[PDB]
Design a protein around this ligand. Structure first.
Ligand code: NI
Lengths: 237, 333, 107, 240, 108
DNA sequence: GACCCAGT
DNA sequence: GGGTTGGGGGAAGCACTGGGTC
């Protein structure tokens, strides 16, 4: 029962995304398959269903690492901490075993940490007001002394309750997360394909960020932020 | 396991040709590859077939020709055409070879010609060698097209360069990282991010590009690449191609190490990021002679260098942020 | 570290918001090496307290805070056994390094 | 088997490889330079045998004699005991050896060298006789200048040592011809000079960084049955 | 050790405000001196203004200043005779004058 | 050994 | 102690022997 927000826990947070997504599946999946097919792996809409479910179920699982809890307790600032990057190493191996390949596990491990605040891979002009910096987030990563035992079996508690594929969890201590979060970024940055590893990764990102209706609103432009939340007319009655 | 053989000619040229092998095998896959260092041989150990190597080269040269023809006997303004190229005779000769392989590699035919390597890829080249008595004519160093094409592909993408012309004169500084103990796909691909495409600064306000040891800091500042050097070991090799008064010659060639500079910037840009770049850019633009004292203090841990640069720069203009001062004492303590 | 609470006073004599611009003390403390000029240089910086007190009030911002004596003795007790220049410069240079900051407290 | 070991504590290197603009240098002195340095010592010390019209054949006959008194093509090996570092020098190399380009044509070329603090040189023989043993012992010293005419080398001592099959890892250089089992480090070395062939030698150089600098540490290759001990520090020598 | 803070507290009352007394000449002369003889002269000039300040603070509402203990006089006397070389004399000449400017709560 | 070349 | 000014503008390497081709 690890809480994910100030007053909202991760448990109801997951069902908030499912209750946002039961209708989004009939709009993007036929449109996401046709753009996914460029990478080489191909499957029907049924496999895409489970793929998008696996991505939505683990998107911010790194929020319980005895760091976010000790920061969002009363008033402690994050000090430029990134909560979800470690989730990437959780989203790398899980797709390795249930798809039995790598070409579709890599894109998942990227899209799972393209959200929230993506990492800026250099090439700055003269300034950066925000904290999109690998150098400052490595300092906050250095204090990651593993994860609590409460999340060791907790990962078995949401995958079996909806579909059920296979039980498997990794064991982060200091370095297995390191040489994976670095290798995924370095492989995604430099490949012969120039713009695919950007447009396709964003295309997979787009359905994952429907969380605004799931959580509490924070901006006045909510009307324009839910244009695709609805659909066309079904019938007259 | 194939273990593609790599000829040994020059410690710098062999670096470029062997280190440029990865840009082609990435295009062809080559999973589970490695690069065992040898100081100058730098041999690639990969369990992949030779057929996909040419499939990598054809894609790489397609990218090169797409870059070359886009900009503008035709002379472009790219790294392999006029960016790092100091000699005009190679402005059109080099691309002509690059497109020549389009008539050789597409239909699966081996190379038969042999071209002349310019000085930009390998500084030891020239016109006047010494064998027993006196000099000779032309360039005795003649490189086969196979090894010739494998150098530019690694030069354009991986090794960066800085160009500062100021009208008739021209200064070109070339930096490259050479592995010395071990290296993998995580590091060689990350080093590709350091490349500065079209580094034509000119004007007069951007004069801070004077001297190579000062231009390297400016190149590194705006590239917050991977900081793996805190656990790895790498060396920086740099050379200059001066063209003062249309006089193509090399006047600066020193060997340094990049690990301590990596650690310095990593320990500096940790408390804050918005003000660190502003501070260093201000000291570089205004305190032109003072930033030399800052850069020199990095490879020797000089205490007076950390103060002289600030003293000389504050007199003109310096923001002097608070969080960055605590970053220097993190290295000092 | 008894440094963050003393470097901001040293920064009071370099910032543009206080236009007096006395770098002689900073130069003296930066090049302090043997035993004595390190304690002599900091005297010149710590002496010019009135200056800052009047200058902050001359614009509107509150008067600057003078460093507390709860940690000044940390320099005297450290300079004694650290007689050699091996590690004495190691902190003498940091003392002058902390003098070049902004500390924007006078908008 | 007798090995003549000498010590050369010269700071900066002198050899320059085949290069223009920049003058790249070996990390350890080439055997050809050592052959020349020893051969030139026999001329001014023993001029009653080295009678020549000019220097061209004077060097050739000395090199031929040195090769004749040698066991094989491998001339001589060296052992570094100090961290080598690649320095940077800017020298004047005039270019006026062509049929034209007036007389004064000189510009600056970066003729950079290498710095070391301690170095050993091990010459190898085939149990020579005594009447020339003293001559070669005296000729081993008096090596004031090596490579070019801008840097000086100062010998320290010279003595003979036996292998005696002592347990020690390889330390001196060895050709890379049949040695595969011995991180490996080979470059063009040019054991044999030319006067108008090119073998590859294994060089004991590896880069290791502790916290600040990388320099060139020791690779400690696998042990070789042949080795020699001196001043406590035993070093492994490769003998064919 | 221990007496430096006590003498610095006394020297603080000469340069702080809420006292209408500002005499930097003596505190300048104590620190940037050249010879051991003038050190004690400056100490006397600084210490002389004890009674004139021991009574005005309570009249102005401030707590009375704590006069340095006579035991510290023994330490400051016995520290200077055996140390005659000027190499490490300036450090002690400025050590006591450093504590003149601090955050002492003279008038809470 | 006489030819070649550049853009803010 | 109580206010006015913190650089000011100008300069911040020319010429000089270019090194490759063919
Ligand atoms: Ni979220």
């Amino acid at each position: 029962s690890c809480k994910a927000f100030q007053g909202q826990t991760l448990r109801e947070h997951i069902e908030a995304m499912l209750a946002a997504w039961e209708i989004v599946k009939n709009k993007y999946i036929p449109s996401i398959i046709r753009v996914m097919k460029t990478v080489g792996v191909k499957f029907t809409e049924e496999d895409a269903d489970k793929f998008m479910k696996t991505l939505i179920i683990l998107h911010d699982v790194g929020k319980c690492s005895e760091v976010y809890q000790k920061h969002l307790s009363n008033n402690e600032p994050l000090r430029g901490f990134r909560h979800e990057l470690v989730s990437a190493y959780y989203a790398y191996n899980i797709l390795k075993d249930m798809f039995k390949d790598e070409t579709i596990a890599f894109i998942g491990a990227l899209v799972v940490m393209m959200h929230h605040e993506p990492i800026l891979m250099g090439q700055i002009r003269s300034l950066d007001k925000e904290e999109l910096t690998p150098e400052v987030v490595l300092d906050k990563l250095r204090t990651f002394n593993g994860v609590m035992e409460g999340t060791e079996s907790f990962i078995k508690s949401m995958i079996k309750e909806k579909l059920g594929v296979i039980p498997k969890v990794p064991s982060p201590t200091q370095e297995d997360v390191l040489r994976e979060v670095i290798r995924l970024s370095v492989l995604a940055r430099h490949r012969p394909d120039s713009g695919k590893l950007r447009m396709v990764v964003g295309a997979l990102l787009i359905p994952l960020v429907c969380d605004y209706k799931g959580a509490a609103a924070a901006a006045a432009a909510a009307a324009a932020a839910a244009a695709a939340a609805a659909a066309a007319a079904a019938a007259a009655a | 396991f194939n273990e593609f053989k790599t000829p040994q000619i020059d410690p710098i040229f062999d670096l470029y040709v062997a280190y440029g092998y990865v840009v082609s095998l990435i295009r062809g896959g080559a999973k589970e590859a490695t690069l065992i260092p040898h100081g100058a041989s730098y041999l690639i150990q990969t369990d992949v077939s030779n057929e996909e190597f040419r499939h990598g080269l054809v894609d790489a040269l397609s990218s090169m020709l797409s870059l070359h023809i886009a900009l503008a006997k035709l002379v472009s303004d790219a790294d392999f055409s006029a960016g790092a190229n100091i000699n005009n005779v190679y402005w059109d000769s080099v691309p002509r070879n690059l497109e020549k392989l389009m008539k050789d590699l597409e239909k699966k035919r081996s190379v038969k010609g042999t071209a002349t390597i310019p000085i930009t890829l390998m500084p030891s080249a020239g016109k006047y060698m010494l064998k027993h008595f006196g000099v000779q004519g032309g360039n005795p160093i003649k490189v086969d097209l196979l090894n010739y094409a494998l150098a530019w592909v690694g030069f354009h993408y991986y090794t960066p360069y800085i160009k500062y012309a100021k009208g008739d004169t021209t200064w070109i500084h070339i930096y490259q990282i050479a592995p010395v103990e071990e290296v993998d796909m995580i590091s060689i691909l990350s080093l590709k991010d350091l490349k500065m495409h079209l580094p034509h600064y000119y004007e007069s306000n951007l004069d801070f590009l004077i001297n190579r040891r000062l231009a390297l800091l400016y190149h590194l500042l705006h590239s917050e690449a991977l900081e793996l050097f805190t656990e790895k070991e790498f060396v920086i090799h740099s050379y200059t191609l001066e063209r003062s008064g249309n006089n193509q010659a090399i006047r600066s060639f020193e060997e340094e190490e990049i690990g301590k500079l990596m650690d310095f910037l990593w320990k500096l840009k940790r408390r804050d990021f918005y003000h660190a770049i502003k501070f260093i850019d201000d000291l570089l633009k205004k305190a032109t002679e003072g930033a030399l004292a800052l850069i020199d203090a990095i490879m020797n841990e000089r205490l007076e260098g950390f103060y002289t640069a600030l003293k000389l720069g504050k007199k003109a203009g310096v923001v002097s942020s608070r969080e960055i001062v605590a970053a220097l004492e993190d290295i000092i303590c | 570290g008894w440094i963050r609470n003393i470097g901001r006073y040293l920064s009071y004599l370099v910032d543009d918001t206080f236009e007096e611009y006395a770098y002689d003390v900073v130069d003296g403390i930066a090049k302090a090496r043997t035993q004595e000029e390190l304690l002599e240089g900091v005297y010149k910086a710590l002496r010019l307290a009135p200056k800052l007190k009047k200058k902050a009030e001359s614009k509107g911002c509150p008067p600057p805070r003078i460093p507390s004596p709860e940690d000044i003795e940390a320099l005297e007790e450290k300079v004694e056994q650290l007689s050699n220049p091996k590690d004495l410069r190691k902190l003498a240079v940091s003392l002058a390094l902390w003098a070049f900051a902004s500390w924007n407290n006078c908008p | 088997m007798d090995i003549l070991l000498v010590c050369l504590r010269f700071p900066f290197f002198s050899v320059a490889k085949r290069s223009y603009q920049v003058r790249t240098s070996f990390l350890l002195p080439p055997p050809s330079a050592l052959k020349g340095a020893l051969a030139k010592g026999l001329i001014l010390l023993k001029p009653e045998k080295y009678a020549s019209s000019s220097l061209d054949e004077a060097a050739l006959k000395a090199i031929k004699e040195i090769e004749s008194k040698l066991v094989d093509i491998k001339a001589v090996s060296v052992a570094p005991l100090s961290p080598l570092i690649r320095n940077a020098f800017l020298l004047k190399r005039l270019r006026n050896l062509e049929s034209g380009s007036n007389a004064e044509k000189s510009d600056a070329m970066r003729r950079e060298y290498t710095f070391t603090r301690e170095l050993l040189v091990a010459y190898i023989f085939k149990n020579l006789t005594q009447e020339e043993k003293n001559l070669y012992l005296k000729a081993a010293m008096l090596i004031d200048v090596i490579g070019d005419t801008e840097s000086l080398a100062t010998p320290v001592w010279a003595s003979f040592v036996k292998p005696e099959d002592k347990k020690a890892p390889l330390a001196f250089s060895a050709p890379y011809t049949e040695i595969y089992s011995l991180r490996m480090y080979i470059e063009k070395m040019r054991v044999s000079p030319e006067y108008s062939q090119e073998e590859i030698f294994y060089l004991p150089i590896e880069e290791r960084r502790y916290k600040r600098i990388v320099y060139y540490a020791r690779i400690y290759p696998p042990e070789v049955e042949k080795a020699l001990t001196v001043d406590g520090e035993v070093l492994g020598i490769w003998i064919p």
